[PDB]
Structure 1
Amino acid sequence: GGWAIAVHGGAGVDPTLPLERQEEAKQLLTRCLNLGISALNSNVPAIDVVELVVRELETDPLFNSGRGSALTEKGTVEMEASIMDGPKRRCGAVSGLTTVKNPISLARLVMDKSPHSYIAFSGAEDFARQQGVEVVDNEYFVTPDNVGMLKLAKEANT
């Protein structure tokens, strides 16, 4: 065979999904898929392609990752991610990120540049800064829509 790629924006979709949001989601999926296809046609390695595509999915506020992440009960964002390169089964993962613009790229750096495969919370925030990645205030990741839903989730918890 030749190249193949899939992208996802999560399971658990409610069947009453508004058409308008269904269209936004397909348009985003298409954009991300095509971004990966473009890299694959340009002979970019698989490990670089999954990183570049998940970065786009992180940046767009629609799905639950990066900016647009679900909120904690405190109303803030704690993000996590993992990446794996198949040929030598190389792994990188991060949890508890609060300022890192693109969690998946920090997981990549754990894979390539740490003796460990998983770094989390304060140590992962330290590592991001040693590595010089883009970091921002947590409020950056928080969107009005998610504040709205957090409210609901809380009260629903009766």
Structure 2
Amino acid sequence: GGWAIAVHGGAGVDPTLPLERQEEAKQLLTRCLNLGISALNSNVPAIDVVELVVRELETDPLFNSGRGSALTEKGTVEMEASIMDGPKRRCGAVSGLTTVKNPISLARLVMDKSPHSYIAFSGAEDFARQQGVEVVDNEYFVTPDNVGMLKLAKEAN
């Protein structure tokens, strides 16, 4: 009858993962889990906890969301996210974000402020600005690791 929490940073891990990166990933997951633990210890609602944890996962460049996101063929970032609150099954989702610092929080705003449950692309960028969330240049999201990764992706044939 108590609190529980899981966080993930993606499936599909290559067995040759270098130790270095293995340790970074674990350190990041710990940090995000501890943030969630701490919010749960002080009675923050489930719905606020998931958003809070995912914002941290988005901010950190290590995993594929937010800054550190995978790149499109043109070398830019297009992000998407969804959120659901169980007790009344309330849903919010966003796709095609290129400018919104924290997609998950935009998903949260779709859930709370929109008569719709899913807003995408220009509409969703327009909704961000109506809602006053932080917006940045697409380059913000693009890291050197991913520029390299996409070089390889495109070599993969």
TM-score bracket, normalised by the shorter chain, equals: over 0.9
Q: Distance in 2 between matches of 1:154 and 1:18?
A: 22
Q: How far apart are 1:156 and its partner, in Å?
A: 1.1
More deviation, 119-128/148-157 = 148-157
SS state of the match for residue 33, structure 1? helix
Q: Deviations over 1:50-79 (max 9, x none)?
A: 000000000000000000000000000000
Q: Distance in 2 between matches of 1:156 and 1:114?
A: 41
Task: Report % sequence identity.
Answer: 100
Q: How far apart are 1:119 and its partner, in Å?
A: 0.2
Q: Distance in 2 between matches of 1:110 and 1:32?
A: 24
Q: Distance in 2 between matches of 1:149 and 1:42?
A: 40
Unaligned runs of 5+ residues in structure 2 are none
SS state of the match for residue 87, structure 1? coil
Q: Distance in 1 between matches of 2:99 and 2:139?
A: 9
Q: How far apart are 1:155 and its partner, in Å?
A: 1.6
SS state of the match for residue 83, structure 2? strand
* 4+ residue segments displaced more than 4 Å: none
Could you say which residue in structure 2 is the equivalent of 1:53? 53
Q: Distance in 1 between matches of 2:8 and 2:65?
A: 11
Mapping 1:4-23, distance limit 5 Å: 4-23=4-23
Q: How far apart are 1:18 and its partner, in Å?
A: 0.3
Q: Deviations over 1:80-103 (max 9, x none)?
A: 000000000000000000000000
| TM value normalised by structure 1 | 0.99
Q: CA RMSD in A?
A: 0.4
Q: Distance in 1 between matches of 2:49 and 2:30?
A: 15
Q: How far apart are 1:117 and its partner, in Å?
A: 0.1
Q: Distance in 1 between matches of 2:150 and 2:139?
A: 15
SS state of the match for residue 53, structure 2? helix
Q: Distance in 2 between matches of 1:132 and 1:74?
A: 28
SS state of the match for residue 99, structure 2? coil
Q: Distance in 2 between matches of 1:124 and 1:51?
A: 18
SS state of the match for residue 115, structure 1? coil
SS state of the match for residue 133, structure 2? coil
Q: Deviations over 1:119-157 (max 9, x none)?
A: 000000000000000000000000000000101101213
